[PDB]
Each structure stands twice: as C-alpha cells, then as structure tokens.
Write an enzyme that holds these catalytic residues in place. Structure first.
Site, PDB file in Angstrom:
ATOM      1  N   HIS A 240      20.520  21.234  58.827  1.00 37.45           N
ATOM      2  CA  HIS A 240      20.130  21.296  57.420  1.00 37.45           C
ATOM      3  C   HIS A 240      21.238  20.456  56.814  1.00 37.45           C
ATOM      4  O   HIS A 240      22.288  20.286  57.428  1.00 37.45           O
ATOM      5  CB  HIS A 240      20.282  22.697  56.825  1.00 37.45           C
ATOM      6  CG  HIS A 240      19.305  23.702  57.340  1.00 37.45           C
ATOM      7  ND1 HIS A 240      19.470  24.350  58.544  1.00 37.45           N
ATOM      8  CD2 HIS A 240      18.175  24.204  56.791  1.00 37.45           C
ATOM      9  CE1 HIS A 240      18.485  25.214  58.712  1.00 37.45           C
ATOM     10  NE2 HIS A 240      17.686  25.146  57.662  1.00 37.45           N
TER      11      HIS A 240
ATOM     12  N   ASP B 253      24.598  22.094  56.544  1.00 38.17           N
ATOM     13  CA  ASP B 253      25.269  22.433  57.805  1.00 38.17           C
ATOM     14  C   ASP B 253      26.250  21.333  58.185  1.00 38.17           C
ATOM     15  O   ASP B 253      27.286  21.582  58.803  1.00 38.17           O
ATOM     16  CB  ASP B 253      24.256  22.603  58.940  1.00 38.17           C
ATOM     17  CG  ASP B 253      23.328  23.778  58.717  1.00 38.17           C
ATOM     18  OD1 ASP B 253      23.809  24.839  58.264  1.00 38.17           O
ATOM     19  OD2 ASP B 253      22.122  23.652  59.005  1.00 38.17           O
TER      20      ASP B 253
ATOM     21  N   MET C  65      15.442  15.653  64.696  1.00 36.09           N
ATOM     22  CA  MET C  65      14.916  16.263  63.483  1.00 36.09           C
ATOM     23  C   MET C  65      15.995  16.625  62.474  1.00 36.09           C
ATOM     24  O   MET C  65      17.125  16.939  62.845  1.00 36.09           O
ATOM     25  CB  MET C  65      14.106  17.510  63.866  1.00 36.09           C
ATOM     26  CG  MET C  65      13.496  18.285  62.692  1.00 36.09           C
ATOM     27  SD  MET C  65      14.641  19.445  61.874  1.00 36.09           S
ATOM     28  CE  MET C  65      14.509  20.874  62.938  1.00 36.09           C
TER      29      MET C  65
ATOM     30  N   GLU D  49       6.882  23.992  57.936  1.00 38.16           N
ATOM     31  CA  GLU D  49       7.061  25.239  58.687  1.00 38.16           C
ATOM     32  C   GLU D  49       6.624  26.478  57.895  1.00 38.16           C
ATOM     33  O   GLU D  49       7.294  26.885  56.946  1.00 38.16           O
ATOM     34  CB  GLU D  49       8.529  25.392  59.117  1.00 38.16           C
ATOM     35  CG  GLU D  49       8.872  26.773  59.651  1.00 38.16           C
ATOM     36  CD  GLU D  49      10.223  26.834  60.350  1.00 38.16           C
ATOM     37  OE1 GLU D  49      11.066  25.938  60.147  1.00 38.16           O
ATOM     38  OE2 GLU D  49      10.443  27.794  61.106  1.00 38.16           O
TER      39      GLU D  49
ATOM     40  N   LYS E  11       5.697  30.538  57.086  1.00 38.30           N
ATOM     41  CA  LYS E  11       6.333  31.834  57.316  1.00 38.30           C
ATOM     42  C   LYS E  11       5.611  32.799  56.381  1.00 38.30           C
ATOM     43  O   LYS E  11       5.399  32.498  55.211  1.00 38.30           O
ATOM     44  CB  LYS E  11       7.833  31.800  57.019  1.00 38.30           C
ATOM     45  CG  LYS E  11       8.606  32.897  57.762  1.00 38.30           C
ATOM     46  CD  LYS E  11      10.044  33.021  57.305  1.00 38.30           C
ATOM     47  CE  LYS E  11      10.797  33.989  58.201  1.00 38.30           C
ATOM     48  NZ  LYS E  11      12.164  34.300  57.675  1.00 38.30           N
TER      49      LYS E  11
ATOM     50  N   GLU F 161       6.861  28.287  64.141  1.00 42.86           N
ATOM     51  CA  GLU F 161       7.937  28.966  64.843  1.00 42.86           C
ATOM     52  C   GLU F 161       7.395  30.253  65.443  1.00 42.86           C
ATOM     53  O   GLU F 161       6.697  31.013  64.773  1.00 42.86           O
ATOM     54  CB  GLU F 161       9.084  29.289  63.893  1.00 42.86           C
ATOM     55  CG  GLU F 161      10.186  30.066  64.581  1.00 42.86           C
ATOM     56  CD  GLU F 161      11.276  30.515  63.642  1.00 42.86           C
ATOM     57  OE1 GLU F 161      11.761  29.686  62.864  1.00 42.86           O
ATOM     58  OE2 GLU F 161      11.640  31.701  63.678  1.00 42.86           O
TER      59      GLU F 161
ATOM     60  N   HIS G 247       7.938  33.425  63.326  1.00 44.84           N
ATOM     61  CA  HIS G 247       7.201  33.387  62.066  1.00 44.84           C
ATOM     62  C   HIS G 247       5.756  33.843  62.155  1.00 44.84           C
ATOM     63  O   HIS G 247       5.349  34.762  61.430  1.00 44.84           O
ATOM     64  CB  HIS G 247       7.264  31.992  61.441  1.00 44.84           C
ATOM     65  CG  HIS G 247       8.640  31.605  60.995  1.00 44.84           C
ATOM     66  ND1 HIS G 247       8.885  30.518  60.184  1.00 44.84           N
ATOM     67  CD2 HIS G 247       9.847  32.162  61.251  1.00 44.84           C
ATOM     68  CE1 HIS G 247      10.184  30.423  59.960  1.00 44.84           C
ATOM     69  NE2 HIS G 247      10.791  31.407  60.598  1.00 44.84           N
TER      70      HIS G 247
ATOM     71  N   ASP H 128       9.414  25.287  66.649  1.00 43.32           N
ATOM     72  CA  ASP H 128      10.634  26.080  66.747  1.00 43.32           C
ATOM     73  C   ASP H 128      10.392  27.195  67.755  1.00 43.32           C
ATOM     74  O   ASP H 128       9.506  28.029  67.560  1.00 43.32           O
ATOM     75  CB  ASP H 128      11.011  26.696  65.397  1.00 43.32           C
ATOM     76  CG  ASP H 128      11.678  25.698  64.447  1.00 43.32           C
ATOM     77  OD1 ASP H 128      11.974  24.556  64.853  1.00 43.32           O
ATOM     78  OD2 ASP H 128      11.910  26.078  63.286  1.00 43.32           O
TER      79      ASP H 128
ATOM     80  N   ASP I 281      12.543  38.752  60.693  1.00 39.92           N
ATOM     81  CA  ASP I 281      12.702  37.643  61.644  1.00 39.92           C
ATOM     82  C   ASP I 281      13.942  37.938  62.496  1.00 39.92           C
ATOM     83  O   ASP I 281      15.050  37.996  61.973  1.00 39.92           O
ATOM     84  CB  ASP I 281      12.916  36.325  60.881  1.00 39.92           C
ATOM     85  CG  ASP I 281      12.932  35.097  61.795  1.00 39.92           C
ATOM     86  OD1 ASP I 281      13.423  35.179  62.941  1.00 39.92           O
ATOM     87  OD2 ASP I 281      12.460  34.035  61.349  1.00 39.92           O
TER      88      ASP I 281
ATOM     89  N   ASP J  50      14.746  36.096  65.406  1.00 47.94           N
ATOM     90  CA  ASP J  50      15.221  34.862  66.047  1.00 47.94           C
ATOM     91  C   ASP J  50      15.907  35.143  67.387  1.00 47.94           C
ATOM     92  O   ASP J  50      17.053  34.752  67.595  1.00 47.94           O
ATOM     93  CB  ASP J  50      16.184  34.087  65.135  1.00 47.94           C
ATOM     94  CG  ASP J  50      15.522  33.603  63.862  1.00 47.94           C
ATOM     95  OD1 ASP J  50      14.393  33.063  63.934  1.00 47.94           O
ATOM     96  OD2 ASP J  50      16.134  33.749  62.787  1.00 47.94           O
TER      97      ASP J  50
ATOM     98  N   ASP K 258      15.248  27.566  67.453  1.00 45.30           N
ATOM     99  CA  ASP K 258      15.764  28.013  66.169  1.00 45.30           C
ATOM    100  C   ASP K 258      15.880  29.504  66.427  1.00 45.30           C
ATOM    101  O   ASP K 258      14.931  30.261  66.229  1.00 45.30           O
ATOM    102  CB  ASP K 258      14.748  27.751  65.063  1.00 45.30           C
ATOM    103  CG  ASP K 258      15.184  28.338  63.733  1.00 45.30           C
ATOM    104  OD1 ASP K 258      15.862  29.380  63.733  1.00 45.30           O
ATOM    105  OD2 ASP K 258      14.840  27.786  62.681  1.00 45.30           O
TER     106      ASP K 258
HETATM  107 CO   LIG Z   1      13.329  32.228  62.336  1.00 48.75          CO
HETATM  108 MG   LIG Z   2      12.645  27.769  61.832  1.00 49.65          MG
END
Ligand SMILES: [Co+2]
Ligand SMILES: [Mg+2]
Ligand SMILES: [Co+2]
Ligand SMILES: [Co+2]
Ligand SMILES: [Co+2]
Ligand SMILES: [Mg+2]
Ligand SMILES: [Mg+2]
Ligand SMILES: [Mg+2]
Lengths: 386, 386, 386, 386
Positions: free
Chosen positions: A53, A56, A87, A180, A182, A216, A219, A244, A254, A256, A286
């Site tokens: 991002h 980041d 990406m 993306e 969600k 993802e 998601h 993802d 979420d 992850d 991710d």
């Molecule tokens: Co996630």
């Molecule tokens: Mg993601």
C-alpha cells in the site's frame, strides 16, 4: 521437498509479514518491520516479489525528500535480491479522514483527496514495474440506513474509477485495475460485498476492459460463499486480474490465516481450478501471522503459505491425472456438462420428441450421479491415501 | 387500519399460502390448497394478483385435457375476483430428474427437457397476460468440488437463457426474465449465489436487456448481506424486474417468514428505498406460513405481509418528510454525496491543491458525520415515537 | 487399505443410509430401504452396529402384533450378521402432531403423548440391548417470540426428562440419556441450541448423572462453533455419552455430508481429541448420502465415513508420535498448560513477587508462542507431506 | 417523552462512550476521554452509574501514587453527580502479555500474573461499592488446534476462578463474578463461546453460587443464536448476574451498535423478558459509538441506548396488558405451557389411555397454534400501530 522458487511466482504484501499484530482488543505484539528486511527475508524463502500500500512504503505525511529516500531503499533491496513488484495499491482506510469512506465519502473534499492520493501512488506503481493496481474500498459502506444512499455512492464510485481509468489512459500506462470485494469490516456493510457485485459494477464503467476483480479467500467466505465457485465465475468472464490467498474459518471477523489453513478442502479446489485454468497471475498472499507469533513465527507462517499451495498443487494434479479419477469423471457425466445443450438450433429442440414427449424422466432420475465415489477419490488424493 | 387494496399491487405466489407444511424433518400439516380458493381468499384480503409455478396450476404428467380444464377454472376465478397474473415461473427443482440441476444438469438430455418444460410454460404465461418470467435455479449447483465445473456450468446456463430469449423473440412475446439468486439450499452451493453474481451473469448473455433479477430478502440474508444495498445496486443498473418479499432471521435455512418478520429494520429500509426510488414493480410475497398454523393462520400470515409493508411505507415516508430529518441529512452531508466529485474533469482535479497539498486532513477528520442522531430519528419514526 | 472392521466400533443410523433423499424442495430420489437390508449391507462394509428411531423399525401406529413381527426380522438379522444396537432414540418430530414440539409443545395432551411414545421405545431399546437413549428436541422451539415462553418450556422439558429418568430407575433399566443439541431447523430457534446449554440444562435435572449429550458435528457448526472445542468441554465434564459424526460446509441448513467432508481440519482435530482422550464410545455416523446418489452411491458414502475416520486417526496418531512435533509442543509450552497454576495455594500466590512486582511483563510479552510452526507440522502430517 | 432517569438504573462502561474509534484497519477518530467527563455527561443524560476495566480508570504502568490520584478524582466525580459503580472488570486482553490468554495462557507465569492483576482490581471494586465483577476471557482460546488442549485450559480456568472465589470468601467481601461468553474475536475461537457453555462451566466450580453469567447481545448473535432464549435459560437457572445491552447486525465481527440497533425485534423480546421476569439487575450498555461520530455523536448514541429500551419497555408492557393479546395467548395455549405435563405422577401417566392408545393424534395435529396472529399483534404494538 515442496520448496518454493521464484518460478512459482509467489508474492506477499509488505503489510502481511509486516503486521505488527494490532487488533481491536489488543496492541502490537511485534515491532515494525523495515520493508527492506521483508524484501530480503521473503526472497530467501523463495518468494517472487512483494506488493504494498502507499502508506507501507512511504510513511503518511512524509516529505518529498523523505519519499524519495524510502523508495530508493526499497529499490536497492529489490534490485539486489531480484524481487519484483507485480501489484500495488492505496491505503484509503487507515487514516481518520477516511472514516466515512474514500471514493464514496459523503464529503466531496475527502473524495477528491482520495483520488489524488491514489493517483500519486499509481505513478509510483508504474515505475516499480507494477502491472496491476488493486482497490479495496474497506471504508466504502455504512452502519445505518439513511447514512448512505447506495445509488448515489455507486455513482460516485463509478466516477472515481472512470477518472482513474482516464488517468492511466492519458499517461499511456500499462496497468489494469483489480477491485477487491468484501462483505463487511471495517464497515457495517461494504459496497460491492462479493465477487459477483464487483463484476457487475465493472460492467457499467466507461472502460470496463481496464477493471478486474481481486477476490480474497477470507472475504468471500465471510458471506459463507463458495470461493472457487466465485473464482470460477471470474475466470468465466476473464476478469480475474489478481487474487489474495489466505485462510478463514467460518463467518466471522477477517482472520487472514495462512493459505491452507481455515477451509482446507476449499483451498484444494481453488488450487485445482487455478492450475486447471492455466491462470498466469502471481499467487499473492494477504494474510496475517497470528499476533501470538514472534518474528521467527512470522517467517514460519509465510513459508507455510507457499508450502501448502505447492502441496495442494501436486495433489490436485495427481487427482486429475488419475486414470481411475478420469473414469469416475465420465461416470458422473462431467464430460456431458462440457457439451452444448442444443448446438442443433432452437427449432430442432422444439421439434425433438426426445427432449419432451419421449423423454423418459423416471429412467433419467433413477440414474445415480456417482458424485460421492468421485469425491472420495478427491479426498484420498488430498490426504495422500491411494 | 392499514387496509390494503389492489391499488397497492400486492401479489402472492400460489405456493406461499398453498404450502402444505412439509419440511426436512416432517410431513404436511395442512391439506393441499385449491388454486381457486387461493385467488378468492387473497382477493378478499385486498391482494392484487398471484404468481405460479407451472406445476402449481397443472399437475405433472397431466394430459392436455386435464390441462386446459385447470387453466379454465383458474382464469374463471381471476376474472370473477379481478385478480391478475403478473408473473409466471417454472418448477425445475421438485422432480427427481432435476436432482443434479436443470439448465446445468451434467446430463445433456436433462438440460434439453428443462428448456422444453420452461418454454411450454412461457406460452401459458403469455396466454395469461403475464409479462414477467422468473427463473430460480434451485438445483443449479453442487455438494462436492469435482461434481461440477462451474465454468462449464455457466456456459450451459448462458446457452439455456440465450435459447429462451431467442424463443420469446421469434414469437414476438412481450415478456421479460427475472433471475432469482440464492446462496445455498437445496444444493450445498447454488450458482449465481447473490444479486451481484446474477447481474454479472446477465451482462454476458446474448441479449442483456431481456434479463433482470428477482431478489428475495431471505436469500441475500442467508449470505448475511444487506438486502437494501443489493436492491439499490440492482435499481442503479435498472435490473430490478421483480422481487420476492419475506422475512429471514439470520444465516440459516430459508425461513420464508412473512414480510416484516425477521430483520425488521432491513424491511423498513427496503420499503424506504423502493418507495423513494419509485419502483413501479408489484410488491410480490414469496413466504411460507409456519407449519404450526392452520388454514386460518395462513390467511392471517398473508394479511400480515401486506399490513407490515403498508405500515413501513407510512413510517418511511414520514421519516423523509420530517424537516428535522432533512436537516439531519444535511448535517451528515447526504447532499454532497449526490454532488459530482470532479464535474470539471481529471486535469482540474490534478491541478487542485485543495484536493491534496493544502487539504487539511485533520480538520476534515475531526468532522463528525452525525450518523447516530440521524439513525435515532429513523428509529423513532419506525417505532412511531416521534 | 484402510479397510474398517467391527473392532473399530463404527455404527450408523438406519435413517442415514435409508434416507430417501426428500428435501423441502424435491421428492425422494431413492426407494425405501429395508432395515434388514441395511444391517446386511452395513455389516459387509465393516460396521459394528446400527441405531434407530422407533419409527424406523416400527410403522407409526402398529399394534402389539405387527410391532412384534417387525422387531423379529431386524433382530433375526442382527444375530445372523453379528451387528449390535448400541443406541436407540425416539422420532418426536415427523408426525404433524409435534409441529409445536413434543416435550415442550404448548398443548398438554401432546406433551403427555410424547412421553408415552418415548417410554415405549425405551423398553424396546433395552429389549434389543441398547444402553444409550438419545433425545433430540428438533421441534422444541419457536419461530416467533410470544409463541414460546422459554422459562415455561424449560420447566416442561425438565419434567419430561425427570419423568423419563424416574421411569428407567423404577424399571431397573441400565440405560442413560444423551441430549442432542441443535441451533435451528426445523424450528426457527431450537431450545438447548449448543453443547453448553444442554450440559447446563442437565445440571438442573433431578438425577444429572443419568443424562449426557450426543453432539453432532453439523449441528454445532451451524452456529459457527469449533466442534472439537465443544467436545473437549463435554469430555472434561464426563458427559460425552454418544456422538454423531458427519460433515457440514459452514453456517446453513443441516447438510449431513459424510464424515470427513465439510470442515476437513475440524474432523482431524476431532479424531485427534477422541483418540487421545481414549473415548470408548461408538463412532456413530448420522449423515445423508446426497439425494443425487443411487443405492450404490449410498454404500460408497457410508464406506467413506469410516475410511475418512481411519485416515485421520492414523494421521493424528502419527502427528502426536512425531519427535519433532513433541519438540514444537514444548516450544509452544503445551506442557506448562497442563501444569497447575498455584499448586502451593492462594496465599503463596499473593506473596509471590514473581507473580506481580518482579514480573518482567515485556520480556514475557516478547516471547513467541510458536503456534504456526506447530500448526504447519500438523498440516504436513494430515496431508502426508512430511 | 422517553426520558431516562436514575430510577431506570442505566449504566455504561467507561470504555464505551470512551471508545477512541480504533479498529483492525484504522486509527482513532476521537481523543481519549477523561473518566470524569464521561461520568458528568452520562449523569446529565439520565444515567444511573458506570462500570470500568481497571485499565480504563488507571492507565497501565501507573504507580500507587498516580493510582491513588486517579481514583480520588473518579471518586469525587461520583459523589458530586451521585453516580455509582455497580460492576467492575479486569482488562486481560489489551497488553501483548495476554496474546495467548490470561487464566488459560500456556505460560504459567502469565497465568499467575493475570490472577494478581484481577485480585488487585477486585479490592478496588469493593471500595467503589461494586457488587458484581465481570470476567471476559477474550484472549482465552486459539487459532490452531494443537496450540491449546481445551481440557487442560478448562482445568486452568477452573483453577483460576476457584482461586478468585477463595479470595473473596477469605476477605469477607460481598461480590459475585459474572463470566461473559463470546464465540470468537479476538481469538479464532474463544473458550466458553456461549451462555450455555459458561453456565455449564460454572457448575463444575467449587463454589458455584458465587458465579453467574454476563451475556452480551452481540456475542450470542455472533453465533446466530436467539439472545432472548439464552437469557431465558440464564434466568431459568437463576444465573443472570449482569448483562450487556447493545446491537449487532448478524453473524460478523463484534459491532457493539447502540442498544435497539441491529436486530430490533430481538431487542423487543429481550426487554419483554427482562421486564416480565422482574430482573432487578442494572441495564448496562456495552456499545461503541461508530468511529464516524464526533464527541457529540457519542452522547447522542448513548442517549439512544436508554431511549430505545424505554420505548420497547412501553410497547412490550402494552403488548402484555392488551386484552386482545391475552386472548391470543390463550388461543395459542401459552397457558397450558405453564401447566405441569404430568402432575398426576408417572404411574398415572402410564395407565392413562387418553395419553396414548386413546389419543386422537390426527385431531390434535389439525389444531392450529395461531402463532402468526399472535406475532402480528406483537408487531403492531412494537410499531406503535394497533
Ligand atoms: Co483479509
Ligand atoms: Mg486483501
Ligand atoms: Co424463500
Ligand atoms: Co443432522
Ligand atoms: Co461487544
Ligand atoms: Mg423466491
Ligand atoms: Mg443427529
Ligand atoms: Mg461485553
């Protein structure tokens, strides 16, 4: 074995292995991770590249001088290790200014700001050689009904994306967008909740050929949906621009989890689909190493993502290549599924007595589908029990 | 009060109040209801029309003789009472021959039969004046990963719908198709699981303008989605061809509670959206009076559907008319949401320092959205506590 | 390989392999299966015994004679095959008379009838040797709030169970009751929805020692709960009198997939738990071969149930016996967890400076749990990728 | 109007209106709120008292002096406004030291440290007049199966709670504990996921009478359960020691919306039960004003919590006082539900022909429950129609 290599095209977001471990009920359990460290530690595990991002790589509020410095360090780390950046994306959810959204914030100034913030990072993405730009509108939604007129919010969203497409077009850029979806979190309900919704939205954009989906695992599973089915529909429409990979154990916040964790069989079928489809995109993860882990656990977790994928890859290949499996496939008439229903024209169908008057429904209904035997062959393969 | 009249355009499927009460763990608790009895009783409650599955009107296997005799008694009741038939749909899920699907059954012979069965009812629908034809693929799906290749299934599904569209055209029929999404049940995972997937699908059909969606409250809620939001996106694209109103209490089996029951606030926001958007479609009810109810309980439940819609309609309207609410809307900037983000263009936004460099993020971040006071005004209206 | 034998103590309900495939949307896809036929077929697969509802062995309403003629065939098939009957249960959910419940039906006459029906199959249960009597209150619940005062329903429910316990004690019967929890379906919400409510409820019965729980994988997962965790609490309390094994793919209607299917990893941790705890209860299966299957698929599915359990048993045992895993266990401090917190007591804890004053919180907080490496070892073992 | 007064006994946690707005994907949108401001503002809104986590009142790291100071300021604000502190709890989830749990953390040192931290706040609670001490094991759980042996965890949990009980008893203190269930978040799965599990756990503690439950609306609804039903069982067992009122919109991350929001009808039935049961506990609110809200939205949201409860209180009272509803209740036989099934005793039930052989099961099945008319009258009252 199952040793990943850059040829496997595995990628990680800097925000994944870089997760400090901050959650809604607890503070960070790990120190911030220097992007250069994450680049070096991932390349050593066999990764192919990293994603990020804007916030980041370049801290928020950074000066033009500081910005140039951060990118130079990241660049030198990418060159020395041979890691790439397939990406890039923008952070339009962390800062308080995006509390009501970014592209769909009620306040116009915030929306314009969101676009400019995105545009600057799109330029940075191009330089780093990123060919895909993901857009996750985690703050695009609401908690109450009257707070957001979805129709107006969608118009604003279309306008935002159209402007974004107009920008890359005028700059002659070679980069496409991946939306993306969600269902929820951080917002009560998030606009474009599933792969299905994102796909539909893209169709009403001025230049649709420029936008895809970045589904993802976690998601879509937050809506109890079948991930490989969702993905199947994305491939069917040629809209799978990025993906993802992670794990999620049910309908809840979420999590992850590392790919392979959570719904194992769903991860198996996903791999099966991607490999059988010949999808060429990077296998991007991710995920968030649990906050219970230390820095060594983070690297163990990341290595686990790639390992499980390769394992499932092998098992899915053996399954499809198995003569007994292929035989069971024909027994479940999967072959007839791939055959057109009426390639003989609509007129021949209406006159085909074998399609109505002379169709023996009972005989047809009595014929078993033989899916259970077929499925246990898939289970034996996945578990290495054949 | 809140007495419904034909002017409100309420419609009930003949299978709603006609449900015998059979569920996964129990037998029927009520006797089969005669379609004529349904029409008469509904018209007496203030209903506007009724919908039907081919098999709800004409028994399966029935001869042309018994066939015309059934439609005769039906037409006779509608004409006497003044009820109309706005929508007609097919039953491609009850007969065991459809255990693996209809349009996407692995067996080709079954898919062809599915098209002929539908087509035959499309003629009856047109003959009855119905201009909307619903397609709910309840058996389109799978319980296991290899039992169905979604990409292949979607191709067969596109073909079937194309052939159907080709048919209505060659016949010059004035009818439109409304696709009904559903996440699961009776199949483990159903294809086109949500309003979004259905929308995305239609855009890939040969003649998109001829197909729309028929979302149902319970269905979208079985995926824990915001029905009003999804309905908005449908309207946003102008694809809300039909709708099935009912209640659902969370993620679980489809309950088909009467409209108003289940998520009450969501029902409220739904009426608010449909009325404020001016959707002219009829408010159709696809519910199931609990098997614990006897025939009288059924009519009470049906009345409840309409009554709850009229009550919510009144409250939603008073909410939007209340000058205090209007002010609260402005305080939350719902008006700016409607205003263009960059009416002057991309190149203007890029050169606008107010949209980036000189944008006081912290000042804009400190602005409360005032959504809570706005939502409590909505609560007081819904609850008649203003 | 992985061929099951009677020693494995695998059992099946007659209603499992005997399910005709009739869901709330379609008709049966398979003919009724003779109980005798079930015993023979199951015996050949390696099953240890079978279970049944009163209505699965005796036609509802049979008189002293016919009732007796039916028990003779079955029993004759038992002695011949060597199959046993470890458990029996009552069917208090199918007949439309229990539409509002059985033990908690609002109508008193219905509640009394429910008890007599249950009590008569208890004598049969004992006559056949079954020492475990399962109780699943499928109809105990409601769809609306005022339809059922739960406090009164629990008073009624407690009385029913108290009466049943008094009856078995008066008859000197050596039988125990296993209450089977469920969140919803067929009722909107079912009383005693999870393993915890059942365990709590049992503590208020007159003779708690006589009752336990019969948790089902699918049921608990319908509430998004960790099944192995729930079983662990039942085991910890010494209340796991029986268990129903099957699969479920998330929060939705009861699918009853074959064991191993659905959440594969939950299945694995569950076998790990039961085996490591040394539970001596029969590994009973309560599943439904998908209606898409013919009689051959039925047996294939039943065979998979035991096969999957056998594979997981071997993988869990291999996992626990692995020196590297035992190492990762210590590293993760699983050994300390099993150690008492304050063996020397409360006063010593209050006076222990290492427990507060001189407790280096940060040093401890920086300590990694090493759960990811441990879990990936568990994943490699399960997938046979070690 | 519906103005709250201290007589209504409404309470709020300091961490509620004091929530800074930080979530998994965003920073705070509101500055820290002085506990003195909260108390003053709430007392002005009609609140009766406040609750707190030790760390909400006394920042972590503080010394006895700083601690003495913080408490002093808090105390005088309480004396000035007249607000009380009915309940106190410990924060055993924020600090990274508890990332693997507190009472059930794998490391023994953490476990002991957790108990000392709790014991120390218990004393402060007695001083502030708190009679109820809540306990939420938000960190007690896991993300992977081998990370935690649940039985051993439950052993440590029992050991920890018995130690706390031995302390309050030896100190002569007058305070009882209230265990708060939660299915998940921040841990993948939390031990004692629901009211049922918590109630079952308590029964195995050494001094059961000293522990009860503190059920939270959102928490039970995060498992798709019926909160009113769970409350009814808690009250049935006489274990409702406290309660957390708020809203939740389905199965998803904890939303902590203001009470009334989310599942509105479930909120109605909740008040109807609490009021009719005559529960004298304080109606405590554990919600979080959305991060989109500024300081003013916070108070407007908190006032909404009390307001909604009072509105529902009035509507439920009317529902129950309504002669037409009392009739409907009799018609649905709620009265017979409250009547003993077999007061004549077991043996008389066994000899009663009208209870079995002479029971017209068909005549009973046909008797409708009349639940729908009863629910609509409940709807009408809730909606202020009638
Ligand atoms: Co996630
Ligand atoms: Mg993601
Ligand atoms: Co429905
Ligand atoms: Co089941
Ligand atoms: Co909460
Ligand atoms: Mg429908
Ligand atoms: Mg069961
Ligand atoms: Mg709470």
């Amino acid at each position: 074995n199952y040793q990943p290599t850059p040829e496997d095209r595995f990628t990680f977001g800097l925000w994944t292995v870089g997760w400090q471990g901050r959650d809604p009920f607890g503070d960070a359990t790990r120190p911030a991770l220097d992007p250069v460290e994450a680049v070096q530690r991932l390349a050593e595990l066999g990764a192919y590249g990293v994603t990020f991002h804007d916030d980041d790589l370049i801290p928020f509020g950074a000066s033009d001088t500081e910005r140039e410095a951060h990118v130079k360090r990241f660049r030198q780390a990418l060159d020395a290790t041979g890691m790439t950046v397939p990406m890039a994306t923008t952070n339009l959810f962390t800062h308080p200014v995006f509390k009501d959204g970014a592209f769909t914030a009620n306040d116009r100034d915030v929306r314009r700001y969101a676009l400019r913030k995105t545009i600057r990072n799109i330029d940075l993405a191009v330089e780093l050689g990123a060919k895909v730009y993901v857009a996750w509108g985690g703050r695009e939604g609401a908690e109450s009904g009257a707070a957001k007129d979805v129709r107006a919010a969608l118009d604003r969203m279309k306008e935002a994306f159209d402007l974004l497409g107009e920008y890359v077009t005028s700059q002659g850029y070679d980069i496409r967008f991946a939306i993306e979806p969600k269902p929820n979190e951080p917002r009560g309900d998030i606009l474009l909740p599933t792969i299905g919704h994102a796909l539909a939205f893209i169709e009403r954009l001025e230049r649709p050929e420029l936008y895809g989906v970045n589904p993802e695992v976690a998601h879509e599973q937050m809506a109890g949906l079948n991930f490989p089915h969702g993905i199947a529909q994305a491939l069917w429409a040629g809209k799978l621009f990025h993906i993802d990979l992670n794990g999620q154990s049910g309908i809840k916040y979420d999590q992850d989890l590392r790919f392979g964790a959570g719904d194992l069989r769903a991860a198996f079928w996903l791999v099966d689909l991607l490999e059988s489809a010949g999808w060429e995109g990077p296998r991007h993860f991710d995920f968030k190493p649990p906050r219970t882990e230390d820095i060594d656990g983070v690297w163990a977790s990341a290595a686990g993502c790639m390992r499980n994928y390769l394992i499932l890859k092998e098992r899915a290949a053996a399954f499809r290549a198995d003569p007994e499996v292929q035989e069971a496939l024909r027994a479940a008439r999967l072959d007839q599924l791939a055959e057109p229903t009426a390639a003989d024209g609509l007129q021949a169908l209406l006159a085909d007595r074998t399609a109505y008057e002379d169709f023996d429904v009972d005989a047809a209904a009595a014929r078993g589908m033989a899916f259970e035997r077929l499925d246990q062959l898939a289970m034996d393969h996945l578990l290495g029990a054949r």
